[PDB]
Design an enzyme around this catalytic site. Sequence first.
Site, mmCIF file in Angstrom:
data_model
loop_
_atom_site.group_PDB
_atom_site.id
_atom_site.type_symbol
_atom_site.label_atom_id
_atom_site.label_comp_id
_atom_site.label_asym_id
_atom_site.label_seq_id
_atom_site.Cartn_x
_atom_site.Cartn_y
_atom_site.Cartn_z
ATOM 1 N N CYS A 8 0.820 -1.223 0.000
ATOM 2 C CA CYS A 8 0.000 0.000 0.000
ATOM 3 C C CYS A 8 0.863 1.288 0.000
ATOM 4 C CB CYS A 8 -0.945 -0.102 1.211
ATOM 5 S SG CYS A 8 -2.366 1.010 1.005
ATOM 6 N N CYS A 80 -4.506 -0.196 -3.198
ATOM 7 C CA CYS A 80 -4.611 1.178 -3.702
ATOM 8 C C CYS A 80 -5.860 1.381 -4.585
ATOM 9 C CB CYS A 80 -3.318 1.512 -4.453
ATOM 10 S SG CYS A 80 -1.903 1.423 -3.308
#
Length: 131
Positions: A8, A80
């Site tokens: 992430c 994401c």
Amino acid sequence: MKKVMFVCKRNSCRSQMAEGFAKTLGAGKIAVTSCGLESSRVHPTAIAMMEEVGIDISGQTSDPIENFNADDYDVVISLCGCGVNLPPEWVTQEIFEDWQLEDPDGQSLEVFRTVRGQVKERVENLIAKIS
């Protein structure tokens, strides 16, 4: 055994939280680690909102993804959502994902108690299709 990397953004905890559900529920199914694009962190509210589900993340660490090899991570999940910056070795895996999953960091404890179940079903349906 196949290894799952959870990845992430810099200020996110959802990679570390995704490892928490995956190491607890995938415990006998897969190997697992987590990291971030410029590294990642653990968060105190993500300890206490998740230990009430029996989950652990307190002992975990991170480094920037480009310090790692990708090859020893046969499976790689991004968090994401339909857009992440990755070197080719981090996407060419037998299974890849990029989850449309938010970070509860800086939000309400009802958002932590919501996003934990969204991570759990993402981890569960991902691990159930590979193991």
